[PDB]
Design a protein around this ligand. Structure first.
Ligand SMILES: [Cl-]
Length: 78
């Protein structure tokens, strides 16, 4: 993945602006339906506490994909 540099940190340290940039990157990188940043106005800590369901309610169309992408990020190697 061509993850942005500042996002190479462990997601537990991502800021709220960092998560804003994360949604921008994914939508562009994976051609996802638009995502409002206001939808996911949170830090990395709070974002990691979300369920794929929660992502979907917040983003009905590209929500679950973001969840799984986040899991890939977290899962460096199987
Ligand atoms: Cl913050």
């Amino acid at each position: 993945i061509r993850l942005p540099a500042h996002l190479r940190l462990q997601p537990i340290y991502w800021s709220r602006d960092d998560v804003a940039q994360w949604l921008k990157w994914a939508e562009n990188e994976f051609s996802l339906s638009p995502i409002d940043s206001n939808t996911f106005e949170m830090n990395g800590k709070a974002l990691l506490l979300l369920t794929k369901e929660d992502f979907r309610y917040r983003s009905p169309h590209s929500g679950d994909e973001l969840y799984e992408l986040l899991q890939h990020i977290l899962k460096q190697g199987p």
